[PDB]
Amino acid sequence: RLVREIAQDFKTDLRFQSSAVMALQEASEAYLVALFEDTNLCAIHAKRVTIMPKDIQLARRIRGER
Amino acid sequence: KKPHRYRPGTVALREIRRYQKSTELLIRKLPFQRLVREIAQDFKTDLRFQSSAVMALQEASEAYLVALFEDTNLCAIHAKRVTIMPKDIQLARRIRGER
Amino acid sequence: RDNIQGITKPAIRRLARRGGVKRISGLIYEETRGVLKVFLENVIRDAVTYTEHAKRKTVTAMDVVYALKRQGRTLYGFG
Amino acid sequence: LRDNIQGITKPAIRRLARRGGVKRISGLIYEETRGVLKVFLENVIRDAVTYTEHAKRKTVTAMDVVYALKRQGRTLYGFGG
Amino acid sequence: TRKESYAIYVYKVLKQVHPDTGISSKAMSIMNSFVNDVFERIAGEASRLAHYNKRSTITSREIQTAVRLLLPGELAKHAVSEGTKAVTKYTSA
Amino acid sequence: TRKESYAIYVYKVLKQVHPDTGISSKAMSIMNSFVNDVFERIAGEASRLAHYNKRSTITSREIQTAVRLLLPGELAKHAVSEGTKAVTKYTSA
Amino acid sequence: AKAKTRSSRAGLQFPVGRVHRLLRKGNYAERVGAGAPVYLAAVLEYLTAEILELAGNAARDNKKTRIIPRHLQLAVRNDEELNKLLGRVTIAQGGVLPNIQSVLLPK
DNA sequence: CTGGAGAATCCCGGTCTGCAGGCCGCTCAATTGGTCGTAGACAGCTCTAGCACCGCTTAAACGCACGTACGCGCTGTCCCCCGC
DNA sequence: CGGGGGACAGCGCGTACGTGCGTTTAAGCGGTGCTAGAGCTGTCTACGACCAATTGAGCGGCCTGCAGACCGGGATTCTCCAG
């Protein structure tokens, strides 16, 4: 449902192969896992065991996405 | 009758402003040339060089190093510190993906 | 319409667990929602671009694979 | 050609860090930078020499260096293009 | 021998936008390298597009699609407009 | 119609190394995708190299250079060995 | 009749003929459409105009009559879209953006 | 708060110079014009899958109570990096 | 090389986390049903490749006056401190 909702600002009444949605889910989950791990490394480097959003922001900033 | 020495850190800020303004190279050319020729020696002997390659490597290296230093500074600040530790460099290169 | 809230906190928790995270702030979930949204638009835009240039009305997984490939995130297992 | 990596003087490393916006520097840093730079230089030079030899040449041209950098995803302008 | 570049066209565009502005050789070569880079990116994307669709020809349509894929937002829109306008002008004349 | 893949050759190689190990279809798809990926990477690199030298033909030498450029260390050495021996055998054959 | 350049026919500065020749020689495809090179030349001209305008603005801000690589780097990095476009590009003699973190400011 | 002092930087004439930019001859790549083969444009057909709907079922999320450990603030020490 | 100030260790705390139980929900599953659009096919036509002749645009070589660089010396500003 989220994917379809996002897929409206570009075009309307778009149909989808199920496999496309599956691939989207897989790629998104893999990306998020990698980001989670990088955030964990950042938070540990801050002598902490709890992740806070500044950790994610620093991670994405170093990755170049920001 | 005092030496009139500046406080620790203001000189650093002044020189940062100086070097965030200039664009020229910061490394002596001759040692860099010696190093690069030495490194290349192990892949192929009697290799000649166009200078333009020499300074092209120099620009690439210096830019990459500046980027790494900038990332390191952010990493160290995240540690609520002001001085960079080599662990910060390691974390930075690891996050970039180079490790 | 708040499908961005369809990503429940338990799912994000599981995701972090697979990522190897032990303790989580409460503010994290919304940040994750935002980042995921950004990623999703970035891919879907190009996917739809491909689907349009193919004069089609249905997006194929192959289009998605192309979009990921051109974004530097190669995916296998779908052709 | 031996021990030129020490030709990278500490003041140069300070200047590099300062251009990078760094204010306070550890002393245990400089050798670490030297090692990382050596790794980077080896990575680029290997491919540059590969390009030079596949052309069956005896001198390395900058144009080769540009190709090597492009292959490593670090594009440089202004050196022939 | 003789080498070709984009120097004259760069200079002309410079005089168009900033008629009273000079340029150094180094910056000029940087401009040339940038032009070549964009050329390669757009051409490779177009070629991949053609291959994906089992086509023998690269049209202006593929160029437009590749521009959309490679350019961010407003740059993409304005470039699309410019390309379309130039195409219509050339076709009419 | 019919779609080609690499399933049969991969199956044969598997039976060579592990004459008793089965495989799922999904692993087969992944293997095929990986093979294709390597193929395009190496082919594009070879073509770029050939254009670099202003040459009309892609020889096995170009593939050797491209493999050296794309593969890390021992993988590169071993693959170079395989290519050399196979080429020599075929030419002698 | 007298030859009339295709660049003039589309009213552009960039050489459409050279563009078409390179397109054919680049092995990008077997055959090249007629309108593609014009589209490409227009796009290149437009982007060149954008960056040149920004660089001229910067150089005048620095109060010099010639654009130097430093001006180029300033213009590219200051623009968000251009910086995004050239996210992986190194410019010789480009320098850096004079940015300093707040916490290092003397207080 | 607040002047002095010293150091650092800015700035404005004055001088010199390499190169940016323009001019020129030529030549080869672009143009023009015509030929011809064929890529795909297009119309038309088939039927697959994608969309929609509904009724169960039950795992999963949710809300909440609760309690504790950790992120954070604060403090003192000392050593080591900076200004020179 | 002196020294200040930054790194760091240690301690208190209070709260925002984690853990577990009762509850509600909506995901998931199986099924039915519909058709839009993907996919495939025949056709032919317009369009691009190709070649011969033409030529002037752009590239090479030359030259220069001035943008900018480099001085020097006052002017101005920033910082540090004793009061």
Author numbering:
A (entry chain G): 69 to 134
B (entry chain K): 36 to 134
C (entry chain H): 23 to 101
D (entry chain L): 22 to 102
E (entry chain J), F (entry chain N): 29 to 121
G (entry chain I): 12 to 118
Article, verbatim:
The Rpd3 small (Rpd3S) complex recognizes histone H3 trimethylation on lysine 36 (H3K36me3) and deacetylates histones H3 and H4 at multiple sites across transcribed regions. We demonstrated a unique architecture of Rpd3S, in which two copies of Eaf3–Rco1 heterodimers are asymmetrically assembled with Rpd3 and Sin3 to form a catalytic core complex.
To explore the underlying molecular basis, we reconstituted the H3K36me3 modified ‘designer’ nucleosome and prepared cross-linked Rpd3S–nucleosome complex for cryo-EM studies. Of note, the two CHD domains of Eaf3 became visible in the presence of H3K36me3 nucleosome, with Eaf3-B CHD recognizing H3K36me3 at the DNA superhelical location (SHL) +1 site and Eaf3-A CHD bound to the H3K36me3 mark at the DNA SHL +7 site. In both close and loose states, the two CHD domains are similarly anchored by the H3K36me3 marks. The nucleosomal DNA at SHL +2.5 is recognized by the HID-C region of Sin3 with multiple electrostatic or hydrogen bonding pairs involving residues Q937, K941, H1221, Q1222 and K1244 of Sin3 and backbone phosphates across the DNA minor groove. Upon engagement mode switch from the close to loose states, the H3K36me3 readout and SHL +2.5 DNA contacts act as anchoring sites to allow rotational displacement of Rpd3S, and the linker DNA contacts are temporally disrupted during the process, reflecting enzyme–substrate engagement dynamics.
